[PDB]
Chain length 147, copies 3
């Protein structure tokens, strides 16, 4: 079937917040990447893993995956930073509805308040003075029919 990895090496200032008002809309957080994938197989799943290096002053990080054409996220996850960079992750298994190429958008933002930096320290400076890499991968798998 399919495997696709999408590295994200850009630094992103995510000043877009996630709130109870915007969480089920398209307005929450800040987009950090877009990814187009095509299932090879009927009846398959995409196992999606976003593993994002992020910093913020003490608080929560929200990640939201949006299928282009939908009006709200199809998966939402949560991370944390104390001030120092931490891996913030989203895992989901999406049931595929055909063989049409589909574009997903990943958005990142503070839980209710605060600015989140992706691939940087909490002030936007390079972590350890270098370029860092976050990753979003899509792995197509066939789920087992359980007897």
């Amino acid at each position: 079937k399919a495997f696709n990895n999408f590295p994200i090496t850009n630094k992103i200032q995510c000043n877009g917040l996630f709130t109870p008002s915007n969480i089920e809309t398209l307005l929450g957080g800040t987009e950090i990447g877009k990814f187009t994938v095509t299932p090879k197989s009927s009846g398959s799943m995409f196992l999606v893993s976003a593993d994002i290096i992020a910093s913020r002053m003490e608080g929560g990080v929200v990640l939201a995956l949006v299928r282009e054409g939908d009006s709200k996220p199809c998966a939402i996850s949560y991370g944390y930073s104390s001030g120092v960079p931490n891996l913030c992750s989203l895992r989901t298994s999406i049931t595929n509805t055909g063989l049409t190429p589909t574009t997903y958008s990943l958005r990142v933002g503070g839980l209710e308040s605060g600015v989140v930096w992706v691939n940087a320290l909490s002030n936007g400076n390079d972590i350890l003075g270098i370029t860092n890499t976050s990753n979003v991968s899509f792995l197509e798998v066939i789920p087992q029919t359980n007897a």
Copy 2:
């Protein structure tokens, strides 16, 4: 080769602690899911990933995977929450014996003290006012 994903969306208050006296028993934590998988290949392994949204007042979260029929966990992992929700994960490779369906239970609880809420804020409220989703997946693979 078998694959299955098991979403978990209930808000669950995990009052069961993990302690040095219960960690090698079936009594630690609070069960948050139970899953039955069937290997298609003999001598395979399951790559298991539990990714659980959890909150607790400042402290450690423990995750334990228990194979039904065993007397203690076959895998143990650790997570953290400051009070705000955070993903707490267990990732392991588990050996399969034969082709019969096998049932696994996932337990979550505080490291030695504290209450852990799964899929909720530390007071049991909905995170961002919505239903939230945790996942446990099993991917069958042939080891080298």
Copy 3:
């Protein structure tokens, strides 16, 4: 091909990661070495390191080094408040042949601080038992 490499020892990771050593081989403490051989050409390895780590309040750094290189090919970040927490590295590396290749995983403090792997910050067993961190290599064919 799938290969899993469990790491069970209690390891004091006293080697720091600093701006001066991050792009060298000198950062961190090696916690494991893994030799894998791609079965298919054009393939990638999906690498997942999930390491139980503790330190006094602060950042944990993880670096994967491929034998022959002068610096890490993947770097990730974790956190501990003083109690053990899973610190992870995820990456996809492109395979270049069908010959065995050796990788090294190093863990250390972000700029300062001792990190313990598979242990409390004083080197005691967590919950009084042996604990397990894992590094796996799953060979897959890309698009």
